[PDB]
Amino acid sequence: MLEQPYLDLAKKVLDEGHFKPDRTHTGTYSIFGHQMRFDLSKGFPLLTTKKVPFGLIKSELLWFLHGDTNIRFLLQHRNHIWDEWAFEKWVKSDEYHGPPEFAAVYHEEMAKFDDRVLHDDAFAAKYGDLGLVYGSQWRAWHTSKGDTIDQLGDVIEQIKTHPYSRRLIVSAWNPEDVPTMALPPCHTLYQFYVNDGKLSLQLYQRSADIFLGVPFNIASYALLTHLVAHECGLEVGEFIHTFGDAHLYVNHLDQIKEQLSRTPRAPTLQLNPDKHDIFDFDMKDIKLLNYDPYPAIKAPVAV
Amino acid sequence: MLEQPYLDLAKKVLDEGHFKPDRTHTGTYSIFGHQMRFDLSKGFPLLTTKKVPFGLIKSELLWFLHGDTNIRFLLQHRNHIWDEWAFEKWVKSDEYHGPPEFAAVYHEEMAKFDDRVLHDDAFAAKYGDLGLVYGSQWRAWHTSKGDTIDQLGDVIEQIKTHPYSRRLIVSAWNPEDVPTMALPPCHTLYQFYVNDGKLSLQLYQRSADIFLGVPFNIASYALLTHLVAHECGLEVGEFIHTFGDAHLYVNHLDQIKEQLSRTPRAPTLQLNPDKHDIFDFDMKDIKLLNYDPYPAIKAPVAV
Ligand SMILES: O=c1ccn([C@H]2C[C@H](O)[C@@H](COP(=O)(O)O)O2)c(=O)[nH]1
Ligand SMILES: O=c1ccn([C@H]2C[C@H](O)[C@@H](COP(=O)(O)O)O2)c(=O)[nH]1
Ligand SMILES: Cc1cccc2c1C(=O)N(c1ccnc(Cl)c1)C2=O
Ligand SMILES: Cc1cccc2c1C(=O)N(c1ccnc(Cl)c1)C2=O
């Protein structure tokens, strides 16, 4: 099945991984350097064996494609993926006043913050704006001359003109910023590849939470490859997912067994037949057919 | 054998690669996304089946470790690897006067240039200095504030303090410079990894000439892993070589058969037992034992 490689990497790490401490202080089982391929011509690799809300994948990806770094857009779409980190520029702040039942009055203050990012421009501008996150790296990289490079936009022209180039690289890794930056980007870099009609994409992912993060990350960049083939009028080849540290968090050990005895089912993807400027896609330009997942598995997001 | 993965990737590309045009206009057989592992504890992976001059690998690597970008240091060591690209800032120049038997009077003007880089400081400074090449990317990355980051140096402290970090990334890919730069770096990025006593390193290599380039590149970064384990007092785990476009150039098709019926032999590496500041290694701090290669195979360096 299309998603076997994901199931194989959970198996491998579980049966061969070596206990590893982590920044988080959860602890992990980990392997270094692993690859999976997904032949995108065979269907779209959204995990069946456990539910991965595609609404969520595409809003965030469209948030990336626009060069947006403000939670607000994600909020206009019920996407709460990135709420945490915007909340902390406010959870710490000097414009801040306010406070187990943390489990419930954390929600009360989260529902507050969401609300006024959603409606108060000045608050949004100060707390909603996540800053140095994939939208800026991708389409507004801060040149040393105080300018800004549209990196993805630039590489798509190059796919169109010089499809055969081995330089079709977009990076998210900025050595000037990674020392003191909230999340040095997990998706360090990717590279496209055109051979005879088919565009492929490889992601180098420095660090991978296999239970929680990877199901999504596969879809974000599988989705990204389609969208880029679409705009270049190419067919789709493969998505290659390459990993540094691929790890299972130790509290996810239960869940991943749970998931591993599921029996995989694979959806198809449908792109607007008459739009091509992907920087200009909204949610109805991307449609997933025949997604039939098993339900969500409850997992403690390890720190 | 230790070098089988290299032999397997030449086989794979030869038996499964798909004709691909290239910047060069030689043409190639290519695959996208491939990985090889070399367990450095089992011996050093310098190809036996064809000769790879280790003198050359280590001078260039020490040239990198010093943050040097001038051909001169390579010249003081009979390393001619990078002569070409320094010659062109002079092969084109406005301080330039001078001129088949290009095959022999190319050599006459190369032997001139080498000589006076070797001895004339001002010429060296103008023509020998390659500029934006792995030494600057690694230990002097040009911050946006006109400063300079010692990136490798910085990540080695982090290995020492935070060995378990999945952020141990050094990159050579600078989006501000890759549009108009002689060689966008083929060795785009690498990442270290420490699990229980053993340091590992993964290289993401965007583009790989499998006959000419890869034998060297394996050794440069296998060598790099040792040197870094050594300085951190770690043992050595694996070198993982990850590729974008791994290609055979079409004029190398003969040679790589020639090489493929050779029968692999694997050297050992010996590091100074009493030095650790690798930024301060000279050539006698690195010694290779029991290297026993088959001889060099003559190959047209495809553009
Ligand atoms: O898209 C993402 C973003 C984050 N992570 C995970 C990987 C790590 O477990 C954790 C924090 O990363 P480190 O900086 O500690 O590597 O978040 C993912 O798996 N996928
Ligand atoms: O260390 C190196 C440096 C260069 N190349 C090769 C790969 C390509 O065949 C050629 C030029 O690279 P491109 O920019 O066209 O990808 O040089 C290597 O294999 N290894
Ligand atoms: C809500 C939820 C629930 C389960 C798992 C995940 C998320 C989420 O936002 N992400 C995520 C995606 C992209 N970037 C980040 Cl920081 C996180 C997950 O991996
Ligand atoms: C002399 C010779 C002969 C055969 C093969 C190679 C070289 C060389 O300098 N390199 C090389 C290494 C690192 N960077 C570059 Cl641009 C080239 C080769 O791959």
Cα separation, B277 vs A38, in Å, equals 43
A99-110 burial code (b ≥16 CB/10 A, e <16): eeeeeeeeeeee
Residue at A117: amino acid letter:
V
Output the ligand 2 site: residues, CB below 6 A: A 166-167; B 23, 186, 207-209, 213, 217
Domains of chain A (ranges; CATH) run 1-303 (3.30.572.10)
CB distance B286 to B64 below 8 Å: no
3-state helix, strand, coil in chain B (%, to 5): 40, 20, 40
Indicate the SS3 state at residue B13: helix
Cα separation, A302 vs A254, in Å, equals 13
Nearest CB to A196 within list B18, B145, B189 = B18
CB contact, 8 Å: A184 with chain B? yes
Q: Which residues of chain A does B32 touch, with a Cβ-Cβ cutoff of 8 Å?
A: 193, 195, 200, 202, 237-238, 240
Please state, in angstroms and as integers, the Cα–Cα distance from residue A22 to each residue in A45, A209, B200, following that order.
Answer: 29, 11, 17
In sequence order, the 6+-apart residues with CB closer than 8 A to the CB of B301 are B212
∠ at Cα A39 (A171, B185), nearest 5°?
25
Q: Which of B205, B264, B278, B187 is nearest to B6 (CA)?
A: B264
**What is the CB neighbour count within 10 angstroms for residue B261?**
7
Output the ligand 3 site: residues, CB below 6 A: A 80-81, 212-213, 216
Distance of alpha carbon A77 from the chain centroid: 16
CB distance A214 to A6 below 8 Å: yes
Nearest CB to B32 within list A30, A200, A206 = A200
- Give distance in angstroms: CA of A178 to centre of ligand 4: 31
Nearest CB to A166 within list B143, B144, B244 = B244
DSSP, residue by residue, A213-231: THHHHHHHHHHHHHHHHHH
CB distance B266 to B42 below 8 Å: yes
Beta strands in chain A (DSSP E): 18-20, 28-39, 141-142, 148-149, 169-171, 187-195, 198-209, 235-249, 268-271, 286-289
CB distance B188 to B29 below 8 Å: no
Pocket lining: A172 vs ligand 1, CB cutoff 6 Å: no
Task: Please indicate the experimental technique that yielded this structure.
Answer: X-ray
Cα separation, B8 vs B240, in Å, equals 15
A152-184 burial code (b ≥16 CB/10 A, e <16): beebbeebeeebbbbbbbbbbbbbbbbeeeeeb
**What is the CB neighbour count within 10 angstroms for residue B285?**
18
Q: What are phi and psi of A162, to 5 degrees?
A: -125, 55
- B39, B134, B169: best to mutate for the A interface, most A CBs within 10 A: B169
Residue with token string 């945490």: A84
Which two structure tokens, joined as six digits, stand for A96?
A: 């801040």
CA-based torsion, A202, A204, A209, A210: positive or negative:
positive
Residue with token string 């990198």: B64
CB distance B250 to B13 below 8 Å: no
Cα separation, B37 vs B238, in Å, equals 7
Please state, in angstroms and as integers, the Cα–Cα distance from residue A216 to each residue in A58, A85, A208, following that order.
Answer: 10, 18, 11
CB distance A266 to A212 below 8 Å: no
- Give distance in angstroms: CA of B57 to centre of ligand 4: 9
Question: Which residue's alpha carbon is nearest to atom 20 within ligand 2?
Answer: B213
Cα separation, B225 vs A92, in Å, equals 41
Cα separation, A27 vs A24, in Å, equals 8
Which two structure tokens, joined as six digits, stand for B41?
A: 């504890």
CB distance B34 to B243 below 8 Å: yes
Q: Which of A228, A208, A206 is nearest to A217 (CA)?
A: A208
For residue A209, which atom of ligand 1 is closest to its CA? 19
Residue with token string 């600057």: B136
- Structure resolution in Å? 2.6
CB distance A299 to A246 below 8 Å: no
Burial category of A98 from C-beta neighbours within 10 Å (exposed 0-12, middle 13-18, buried 19 and up): exposed
Q: What are phi and psi of B180, to 5 degrees?
A: -115, 65
- Subunit contact A242:B242, Cβ cutoff 8 A: yes
Tell me, letter by letter, the H, E, C secondary structure of A65-108.
HHCCCEHHHHHCCCCCCCHHHHHHHHHCCCCCCCCCCHHHHHHH
Q: How many residues does chain B have?
A: 303
In sequence order, the 6+-apart residues with CB closer than 8 A to the CB of A83 are A71, A110, A113, A114
Burial category of B191 from C-beta neighbours within 10 Å (exposed 0-12, middle 13-18, buried 19 and up): buried
What radius of gyration, in Å, describes the C-alpha atoms of chain A?
A: 20
Q: Any alpha helices (H) in A4-82, and if so which ranges?
A: 4-16, 54-66, 71-75
Which two structure tokens, joined as six digits, stand for B286?
A: 């690195």
| Residues in chain B whose C lies over 2.5 Å from the next residue's N (breaks after) | 99, 265
